[PDB]
Write a protein that binds this ligand. Structure first.
Ligand SMILES: CC(=O)Nc1cc(C(=O)O)ccc1F
Length: 171
């Protein structure tokens, strides 16, 4: 049975309970904390790619008003984000199960850009999601997993200094 678990969930929970923020820049900014995923129950010999994308958690624009995040009143459809292919992809089940799969090199941007970077809408709330795609084999197969604990608002600068302080303390 394919088990997918969040590494350092205790750290992510400190961020979530303050409302997490991730910087987006024109050229793209790496994530802290990094999404790290513990995977077991793959076929050690089968061949898989690991994909990361970001679900808009709601259809609203958020704003930091009097020290608190509040949703706008005017929801718009949020298009699904583009997918980031983990650079170790494609790779054997054994490669993925031997250490946490770490998405340390994904860069979050607010502008349609060359390559690699994932474009997110500023002041939208996002839920990281992975897809494990069985490749090359006869039967293609996808398993998807969400990480509620890793939800964040995409921001061009930090609003809640409590987040700034946690980022610096643990980076
Ligand atoms: C570099 C790499 O792994 N690419 C990729 C290929 C397929 C495919 O062949 O369907 C599915 C997912 C992927 F991420």
């Amino acid at each position: 049975e394919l088990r997918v678990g969040l590494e350092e969930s205790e750290l992510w929970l400190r961020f979530k309970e303050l409302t997490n923020e991730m910087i987006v820049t024109k050229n793209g900014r790496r994530m802290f904390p990094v999404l790290k995923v513990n995977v077991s129950g793959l076929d050690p010999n089968a061949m898989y790619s690991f994909l990361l994308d970001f679900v808009a958690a709601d259809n609203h624009r958020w704003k930091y008003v009097n020290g608190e995040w509040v949703p706008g009143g005017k929801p718009e459809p949020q298009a699904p984000s583009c997918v980031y292919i983990h650079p170790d992809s494609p790779n054997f089940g054994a490669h993925w199960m031997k250490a946490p799969v770490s998405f340390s090199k994904v860069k979050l941007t607010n502008k349609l850009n060359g390559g690699g970077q994932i474009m997110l809408n500023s002041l939208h709330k996002y839920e990281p999601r992975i897809h494990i795609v069985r490749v090359g084999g006869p039967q293609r197969m996808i398993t998807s997993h969400c990480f509620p604990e890793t939800q964040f608002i995409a921001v061009t600068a930090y609003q809640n200094e409590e987040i700034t302080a946690l980022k610096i303390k643990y980076n």
